[PDB]
Design an enzyme around this catalytic site. Structure first.
Site, PDB file in Angstrom:
ATOM      1  N   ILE A  26       0.811  -1.217   0.000  1.00 21.84           N
ATOM      2  CA  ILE A  26       0.000   0.000   0.000  1.00 21.84           C
ATOM      3  C   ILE A  26       0.850   1.274   0.000  1.00 21.84           C
ATOM      4  O   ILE A  26       0.370   2.336  -0.375  1.00 21.84           O
ATOM      5  CB  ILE A  26      -0.983   0.053   1.190  1.00 21.84           C
ATOM      6  CG1 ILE A  26      -0.264  -0.174   2.517  1.00 21.84           C
ATOM      7  CG2 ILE A  26      -2.106  -0.964   1.007  1.00 21.84           C
ATOM      8  CD1 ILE A  26      -1.152   0.064   3.717  1.00 21.84           C
ATOM      9  N   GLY A  27       2.100   1.185   0.433  1.00 21.85           N
ATOM     10  CA  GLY A  27       2.973   2.340   0.373  1.00 21.85           C
ATOM     11  C   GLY A  27       4.418   1.991   0.612  1.00 21.85           C
ATOM     12  O   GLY A  27       4.753   0.831   0.842  1.00 21.85           O
ATOM     13  N   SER A  28       5.265   3.010   0.543  1.00 20.65           N
ATOM     14  CA  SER A  28       6.701   2.859   0.745  1.00 20.65           C
ATOM     15  C   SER A  28       7.244   4.122   1.380  1.00 20.65           C
ATOM     16  O   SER A  28       6.719   5.221   1.152  1.00 20.65           O
ATOM     17  CB  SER A  28       7.414   2.614  -0.578  1.00 20.65           C
ATOM     18  OG  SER A  28       8.743   2.182  -0.342  1.00 20.65           O
ATOM     19  N   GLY A  29       8.290   3.962   2.180  1.00 20.33           N
ATOM     20  CA  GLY A  29       8.886   5.084   2.887  1.00 20.33           C
ATOM     21  C   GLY A  29      10.347   4.856   3.180  1.00 20.33           C
ATOM     22  O   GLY A  29      10.984   4.001   2.570  1.00 20.33           O
ATOM     23  N   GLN A  31      11.855   3.592   5.788  1.00 23.80           N
ATOM     24  CA  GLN A  31      12.177   2.241   6.278  1.00 23.80           C
ATOM     25  C   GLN A  31      11.331   1.160   5.612  1.00 23.80           C
ATOM     26  O   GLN A  31      10.793   0.274   6.270  1.00 23.80           O
ATOM     27  CB  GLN A  31      12.121   2.140   7.811  1.00 23.80           C
ATOM     28  CG  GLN A  31      10.878   2.697   8.462  1.00 23.80           C
ATOM     29  CD  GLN A  31      11.056   4.115   8.946  1.00 23.80           C
ATOM     30  OE1 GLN A  31      11.809   4.896   8.362  1.00 23.80           O
ATOM     31  NE2 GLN A  31      10.356   4.461  10.018  1.00 23.80           N
ATOM     32  N   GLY A  32      11.206   1.262   4.292  1.00 25.22           N
ATOM     33  CA  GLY A  32      10.715   0.164   3.474  1.00 25.22           C
ATOM     34  C   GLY A  32       9.234   0.164   3.185  1.00 25.22           C
ATOM     35  O   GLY A  32       8.561   1.194   3.301  1.00 25.22           O
ATOM     36  N   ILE A  33       8.739  -1.015   2.803  1.00 22.78           N
ATOM     37  CA  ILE A  33       7.382  -1.181   2.284  1.00 22.78           C
ATOM     38  C   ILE A  33       6.379  -1.349   3.422  1.00 22.78           C
ATOM     39  O   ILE A  33       6.683  -1.926   4.463  1.00 22.78           O
ATOM     40  CB  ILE A  33       7.278  -2.402   1.331  1.00 22.78           C
ATOM     41  CG1 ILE A  33       8.242  -2.251   0.137  1.00 22.78           C
ATOM     42  CG2 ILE A  33       5.841  -2.607   0.843  1.00 22.78           C
ATOM     43  CD1 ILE A  33       7.678  -1.517  -1.070  1.00 22.78           C
ATOM     44  N   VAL A  34       5.185  -0.817   3.210  1.00 20.62           N
ATOM     45  CA  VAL A  34       4.067  -1.079   4.083  1.00 20.62           C
ATOM     46  C   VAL A  34       3.047  -1.874   3.273  1.00 20.62           C
ATOM     47  O   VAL A  34       2.820  -1.570   2.099  1.00 20.62           O
ATOM     48  CB  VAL A  34       3.463   0.228   4.613  1.00 20.62           C
ATOM     49  CG1 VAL A  34       2.373  -0.055   5.637  1.00 20.62           C
ATOM     50  CG2 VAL A  34       4.557   1.088   5.222  1.00 20.62           C
ATOM     51  N   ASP A 145       8.713  17.411  12.379  1.00 21.34           N
ATOM     52  CA  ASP A 145       8.806  16.840  11.045  1.00 21.34           C
ATOM     53  C   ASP A 145       7.471  16.309  10.493  1.00 21.34           C
ATOM     54  O   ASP A 145       7.425  15.326   9.762  1.00 21.34           O
ATOM     55  CB  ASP A 145       9.857  15.741  11.027  1.00 21.34           C
ATOM     56  CG  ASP A 145      10.358  15.446   9.636  1.00 21.34           C
ATOM     57  OD1 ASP A 145      10.537  16.391   8.828  1.00 21.34           O
ATOM     58  OD2 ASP A 145      10.555  14.261   9.339  1.00 21.34           O
TER      59      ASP A 145
HETATM   60  N1  LIG Z   1      -1.214   2.353   8.904  1.00 17.24           N
HETATM   61  C1  LIG Z   1      -1.270   2.653   7.603  1.00 17.24           C
HETATM   62  N2  LIG Z   1      -2.447   2.604   6.968  1.00 17.24           N
HETATM   63  C2  LIG Z   1      -2.457   2.946   5.619  1.00 17.24           C
HETATM   64  N3  LIG Z   1      -1.284   3.322   4.984  1.00 17.24           N
HETATM   65  C3  LIG Z   1      -0.147   3.364   5.680  1.00 17.24           C
HETATM   66  C4  LIG Z   1      -0.132   3.035   6.978  1.00 17.24           C
HETATM   67  N4  LIG Z   1       1.132   3.175   7.388  1.00 17.24           N
HETATM   68  C5  LIG Z   1       1.882   3.557   6.358  1.00 17.24           C
HETATM   69  N5  LIG Z   1       1.085   3.679   5.295  1.00 17.24           N
HETATM   70  C6  LIG Z   1       1.392   4.068   3.925  1.00 17.24           C
HETATM   71  O1  LIG Z   1       2.815   3.830   3.667  1.00 17.24           O
HETATM   72  C7  LIG Z   1       3.439   5.092   3.331  1.00 17.24           C
HETATM   73  C8  LIG Z   1       4.841   5.212   3.948  1.00 17.24           C
HETATM   74  O2  LIG Z   1       4.751   4.773   5.295  1.00 17.24           O
HETATM   75  P1  LIG Z   1       5.744   5.354   6.432  1.00 17.24           P
HETATM   76  O3  LIG Z   1       7.006   5.072   5.751  1.00 17.24           O
HETATM   77  O4  LIG Z   1       5.393   4.555   7.601  1.00 17.24           O
HETATM   78  O5  LIG Z   1       5.197   6.722   6.373  1.00 17.24           O
HETATM   79  C9  LIG Z   1       2.495   6.174   3.914  1.00 17.24           C
HETATM   80  O6  LIG Z   1       2.603   7.382   3.175  1.00 17.24           O
HETATM   81  C10 LIG Z   1       1.132   5.553   3.689  1.00 17.24           C
HETATM   82  O7  LIG Z   1       0.733   5.744   2.343  1.00 17.24           O
END
Ligand SMILES: Nc1ncnc2c1ncn2[C@@H]1O[C@H](COP(=O)(O)O)[C@@H](O)[C@H]1O
Length: 354
Positions: A26-29, A31-34, A145
């Site tokens: 559903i996403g990436s950041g 510290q990796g994939i979610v 931040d």
């Molecule tokens: N609990 C969550 N529910 C839905 N999307 C999430 C959730 N946590 C992280 N994400 C998605 O993953 C992306 C990067 O996550 P993070 O790196 O944790 O911000 C975010 O911008 C969201 O699009």
């Protein structure tokens, strides 16, 4: 028997508890994939984030450990909660990965920013951001931040902040991953000390971007970013400059000057719903809140409590959602403590095992 199973998502393997089924990215950041998954035990969808070897450097290590301790102890509906934490590895010496299981939200704020929103939704989103932020501040946590990518929303306009920001302390990493600085306050950009309302600045940047559908202060680096700030808001006055360190103060003075645009110019009526009288009035109130949040000098920038009391916001005001009991924070050595990677590994392990 194994409690876990393995499946590939992108250039990654997720090894997760068997209760979690049908993983989809559903996403990436940073510290990796979610991933999204169905949790067969709770009979509901969850989000699952994999931390790959978070002890691998001080930066990942401090963030991971801090985020664990805080997600556990913090209980507020505008701050993302942890449902479950696990590692598939059996021992400290085998330990590699941490998996965070959170309630599943539908989107991040960058996606909301790309759509038009009525005033009721916009103001409710901001109200929730402020509630969350107030709850952090009540626990001693100043984020510094906030950004749209680390804030998530459901279809029903409920909102949650994902992370706990920067520690009051202190950060080099070899990576492709570029950090987003656009929402950082002047006082962070110019390292001049800060208080609670450092986070108001970021809210103003997000609100402005919600209205303009463009990042307010884009820059390649803090030089650019500072130019973009002063060329829209104008060069700050002298009583602000006086509070800068002589090396940065010197630098801010000698920048090319701008008196700066005005808020009606910065955010024209064509950006707002303003067809009815209701919406004409709400548009005026919104611009007014903006002009009090996007103030360079924090001594004159509106506070969280006063922002919650602003007419654009206070329609949602509720002493349950504000004024909640502050978290415990059992550690208190938390924001600042330094360690080797070997030490961080065991710290993080202990917390995952409790
Ligand atoms: N609990 C969550 N529910 C839905 N999307 C999430 C959730 N946590 C992280 N994400 C998605 O993953 C992306 C990067 O996550 P993070 O790196 O944790 O911000 C975010 O911008 C969201 O699009």
């Amino acid at each position: 028997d194994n409690q876990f199973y393995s499946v590939e998502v992108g250039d990654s393997t997720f090894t997760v508890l068997k209760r979690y089924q049908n993983l989809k990215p559903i996403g990436s950041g940073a510290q990796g994939i979610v991933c999204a998954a169905y949790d067969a035990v709770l009979d509901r969808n969850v989000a699952i984030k994999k931390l790959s070897r978070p002890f691998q450097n001080q930066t990942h290590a401090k963030r991971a450990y801090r985020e664990l301790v805080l997600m556990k102890c913090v209980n507020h509906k505008n701050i993302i909660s942890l449902l479950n934490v696990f590692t598939p590895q059996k021992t400290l010496e085998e330990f590699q990965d941490v998996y965070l299981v959170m309630e599943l939200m539908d989107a991040n704020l960058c996606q909301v920013i790309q759509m038009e929103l009525d005033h009721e939704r916009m103001s409710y989103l901001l109200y929730q951001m402020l509630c969350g932020i107030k709850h952090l501040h009540s626990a001693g946590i100043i984020h510094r931040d906030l950004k749209p990518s680390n804030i998530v929303v459901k279809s029903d306009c409920t909102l949650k902040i994902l992370d706990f920001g920067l520690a009051r302390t202190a950060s080099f990493m070899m990576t492709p991953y570029v950090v987003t600085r656009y929402y950082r306050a002047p006082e962070v950009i110019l390292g001049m000390g800060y208080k609670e309302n450092v986070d108001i600045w970021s809210v103003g940047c997000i609100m402005g971007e919600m209205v303009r559908h463009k990042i307010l202060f884009p820059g390649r680096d803090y030089i650019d970013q500072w130019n973009k700030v002063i060329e829209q808001l104008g060069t700050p006055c002298p009583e602000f400059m006086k509070k800068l360190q002589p090396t940065v103060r010197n630098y801010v003075e000698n920048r090319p000057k701008y008196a700066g645009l005005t808020f009606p110019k910065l955010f024209p009526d064509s950006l707002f719903p303003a067809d009815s009288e209701h919406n004409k009035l709400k548009a005026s109130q919104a611009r007014d809140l903006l002009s009090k949040m996007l103030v360079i000098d924090p001594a004159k920038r509106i506070s969280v409590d006063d922002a919650l009391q602003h007419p654009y916001i206070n329609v949602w005001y509720d002493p349950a959602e504000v004024e909640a009991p502050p978290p415990q924070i059992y550690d208190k050595q938390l924001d600042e403590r330094e360690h080797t990677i070997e030490e961080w590994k065991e710290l993080i392990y202990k917390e995952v095992m409790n």
